[PDB]
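Note on ligand handling. Small-molecule inputs were canonicalized before submission; formal charges were left as drawn, and no protonation-state enumeration was performed. Where a ligand contained multiple stereocentres, the stereochemistry in the source SMILES was retained. For calcium ion, this procedure yielded the string shown in the input block below.
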Amino acid sequence: TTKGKVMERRILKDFQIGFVENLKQEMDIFSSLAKVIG
Amino acid sequence: MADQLTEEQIAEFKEAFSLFDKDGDGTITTKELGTVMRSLGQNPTEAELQDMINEVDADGNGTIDFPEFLTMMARKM
Amino acid sequence: GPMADQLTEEQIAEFKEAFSLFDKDGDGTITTKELGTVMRSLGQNPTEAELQDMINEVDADGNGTIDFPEFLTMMARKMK
Ligand SMILES: [Ca+2]
Ligand SMILES: [Ca+2]
Ligand SMILES: [Ca+2]
Ligand SMILES: [Ca+2]
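Structure output:
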């Protein structure tokens, strides 16, 4: 159970959903994407 | 990129898939992602969960299957 | 058309992550269809020609799709 939860947390971090939600709010898609990473 | 995976890595990613595929139907949905996230103290909105599915839903069928899960896992190594 | 003078490794990792959101099937290219899918998530409804215009201005070798070297070159450029 603890081993499974550690695996789950690691995989969820792989979605980078905070970074992805940042793009979506910012949205010339490629310029606006440069701004988020800027 | 999924082809460059060892037997042990595939076996590991298969086990990881089943942790998310709560009903064992071969797909991960927004609801299954939400259940796991909340069990780890995260409280995503429905829109965030759909965005997460949309990140890796390559065939656009609305869920994550094991091929898509393996592509995600392999490319992020 | 140079890339930005200061291009950090972590910015490059974010470019890879952004590329992977377009290239969902992981074949190393972005097609007009994959671009349209992502922009429809954004609330835009581009035409099949508008999509081809945006592909064409990133597509440095003119083969009709965007690979990661092309994407990264354009991104570090717009980073200025
Ligand atoms: Ca399921
Ligand atoms: Ca799918
Ligand atoms: Ca692709
Ligand atoms: Ca090209």
